[PDB]
Design a protein around this nucleic acid. Structure first.
Lengths: 140, 141, 176, 164
RNA sequence: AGCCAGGAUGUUGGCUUAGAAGCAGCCAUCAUUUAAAGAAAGCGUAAUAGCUCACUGGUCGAGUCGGCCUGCGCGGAAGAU
């Protein structure tokens, strides 16, 4: 429901961390709110996705880049990597050392933390206006 | 700024202080640890005796840590005890229920020392003179 | 009684036009206010104007105190300027200034447009804060009142367009 | 028909003690707190000092009815008066405790043998106000010129003479 | 009168009460550095906390306030073509 007014994603993410007591990991980042919620950013490729009718959500590679988000997008993408790092001492060491890593390893490391019940990846999309549901499934 | 606040007011029986009515919500919220507090709390309160009603004022450091100053047992409590009576009357002193010596009032005045507003222990004693009257102790010489 | 006898002290050569009942204050900032005052005498004097009743009238000495207040007010007008603060409270309420017309999403079906009279302008630091600047003290608070008439602050959660800061004591909902 | 005695009497009591006072200190302090005054009054009475807030109406009338040592004439705004009856220094020393804490630009003046001392100059005099250590420093300047400079010089010159 | 500032300490007085805590109720109805602050006049999480209060000192620089007797007015005052 990010099409609805008064919606801002980031506070909800903080509310889970504060009240409920597990760490959210934003496995997307939004593009806009109210009307302006008419795309999403995929942190994993740092690409961004659009819907028109239902049928533009068929188009599913380089649909856009995250544009003028980029400063916010950086710290969250670091937090994405930071989260995949702590799943073992070995991944953590590779991060500290000064090396870079892949989307496939990101999914494998993250998936162990989700599966064990450590880390809760947050995704986003208004269902009613047919935004992001297909993207939401991909994460499932 | 830092998660620090000073002189927060607390009254808890001396050296036993674990549960949520004694520790409140504030120890949990400010990151403070009850077990670690109990160890610090026994360490200034043993000498003046455990199990007494204690005034304690807590100052909080943002390392999830604590200091505490005790303003010693309250004079009203200490006078009631030093004259021995179990509890005052619903018409106290006017229709009294016990007695206190002046030598007993002065003994309170030394325990409350620097924390008494009066000029000297005779003035200070005169301050707790009115407290001792208020609780229904009849003043023997 | 006192402040029928507080006699201006005109700051920095303000333009004072005296018609024997009408006074017009001109300047830069607070330019071109006017007032028409009958039962009173106002002498220009040494930049330190004199207010009293015309011919010792019983009902005219009230209005001598009024004359003084409007005159001191116009002096504040050309010096300092006047009540800025309107702001909007709680979810989804937001407003954009468009020339001298203010469009406000105050949650009506049609986002409302309020247009300003001649002496006065506004602009918004961000869409939830509105700052008004204008010549005449009566006109500026009237625009604050007429905006505040679109939504009075509703006291359960304080939501509304709020002039100045404080406006309501607030209360609980279900309570006890 | 003006039957209130409190204002007529309390001027007289303050005039007697403020004439009797040795050094006194005149400060301004809207924005006071009970705590800071209470601890300072507490130690002051050991040292032979009272520190007071009194009406300015009362102090001006006190200067009017008798010539004043501790003022020339009263000062605008609120006025606090610290004054000492035993140790002469003491009234100013309490200001040098107080200045560390709440407010330090409060002092308008202090009076010393009835001459007025402004806010900057008092800060040196009040730092050392004890006479014995002051007599020793007045003597130290004269004692260096009189007898010290000769004896210190000949010891440095005998050390040069037996090193060559 | 406004404006600025203080508006405390023993002490969360005693009792009663789940709570009783200046401010539900009863009894004390005081003392203390004090220039001053009632063991409290009203609000306040019904009460812990929070806000104002008489009272205290500035700015302020003149009349001011409470009663009563008494003329006159006011609202209280809504019906049948």
């Amino acid at each position: 429901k990010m099409d609805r007014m008064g919606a801002n994603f980031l506070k909800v993410v903080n509310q889970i961390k504060t009240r409920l007591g597990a760490n959210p990991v934003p496995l997307q980042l939004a593009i806009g709110a109210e009307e302006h919620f008419t795309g999403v950013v995929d942190l994993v490729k740092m690409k961004a996705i659009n819907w028109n009718d239902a049928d533009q959500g068929v188009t599913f590679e380089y649909e856009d880049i995250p544009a003028d988000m980029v400063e916010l997008a950086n710290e969250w993408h670091q937090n994405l990597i930071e989260s995949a790092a702590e799943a073992s001492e070995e991944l953590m060491e590779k991060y500290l050392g000064g090396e870079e890593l892949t989307e496939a390893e990101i999914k494998g490391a993250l998936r162990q933390r989700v599966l064990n019940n450590e880390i809760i990846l947050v995704t986003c999309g208004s269902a009613f206006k047919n935004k992001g549901v297909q993207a939401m499934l991909d994460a499932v | 700024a830092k998660k620090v606040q000073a002189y927060v007011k607390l009254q808890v029986a001396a050296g036993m202080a674990n549960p949520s009515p004694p520790v409140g919500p504030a120890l949990g919220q400010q990151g403070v640890n009850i077990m670690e507090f109990c160890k610090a709390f026994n360490a200034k309160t043993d000498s003046i005796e455990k199990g007494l009603p204690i005034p304690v004022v807590i100052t909080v450091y943002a390392d999830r840590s604590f200091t505490f100053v005790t303003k010693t047992p309250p004079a009203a409590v200490l006078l009631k005890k030093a004259a021995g009576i179990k509890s005052g009357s619903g018409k106290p002193n006017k229709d009294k229920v016990g007695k206190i010596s002046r030598a007993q009032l002065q003994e309170i005045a030394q325990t409350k020392a620097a924390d008494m507003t009066g000029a000297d222990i005779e003035a200070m004693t005169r301050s707790i003179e009115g407290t001792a009257r208020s609780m229904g102790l009849v003043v023997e010489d | 009684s006192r402040v029928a006898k507080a006699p201006v002290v005109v700051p920095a050569g303000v333009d004072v036009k005296i018609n024997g009942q009408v006074i017009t204050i001109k300047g830069k900032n607070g330019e071109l206010t006017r007032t028409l005052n009958d039962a009173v005498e106002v002498k220009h004097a040494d930049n330190t104007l004199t207010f009293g009743p015309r011919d010792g009238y019983a009902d005219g000495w009230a209005q001598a105190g009024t004359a003084r207040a409007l005159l001191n007010s116009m002096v504040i007008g050309v010096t300092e300027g006047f009540t800025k603060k309107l702001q909007l409270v709680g979810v989804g309420y937001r407003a954009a200034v468009k020339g001298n017309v203010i469009n406000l999403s105050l949650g009506f079906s049609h986002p409302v447009d309020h247009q300003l009279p001649a002496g006065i302008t506004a602009e918004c630091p961000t869409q939830t804060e509105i700052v008004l600047k204008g010549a005449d003290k009566q006109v500026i608070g009237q625009v604050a009142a007429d905006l505040r008439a679109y939504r009075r602050p509703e006291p359960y959660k304080g939501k509304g367009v709020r002039y100045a800061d404080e406006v309501v004591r607030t209360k609980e909902a279900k309570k006890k | 028909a003006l039957n209130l005695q409190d204002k007529q009497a309390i001027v007289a009591e303050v005039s007697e003690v403020a004439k009797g006072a040795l050094s006194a200190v005149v400060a301004d302090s809207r924005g006071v707190t009970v705590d800071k005054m209470t601890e300072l009054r507490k130690a002051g009475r050991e040292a032979g000092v009272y520190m007071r807030v009194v009406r300015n109406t009362l102090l001006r009338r006190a200067v009017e009815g008798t010539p004043f040592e501790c003022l020339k004439d009263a000062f605008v705004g609120p006025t606090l008066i610290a004054y000492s009856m035993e140790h002469p220094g003491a009234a100013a020393r309490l200001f040098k405790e107080f200045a560390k804490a709440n407010a330090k630009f409060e002092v308008k003046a202090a009076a010393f043998e009835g001459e007025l001392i402004p806010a900057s100059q008092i800060d040196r005099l009040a730092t050392l106000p004890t006479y014995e250590e002051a007599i020793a420093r007045l003597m130290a300047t004269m004692k260096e010129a009189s007898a010290g400079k000769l004896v210190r010089t000949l010891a440095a010159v005998r050390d040069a003479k037996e090193a060559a």
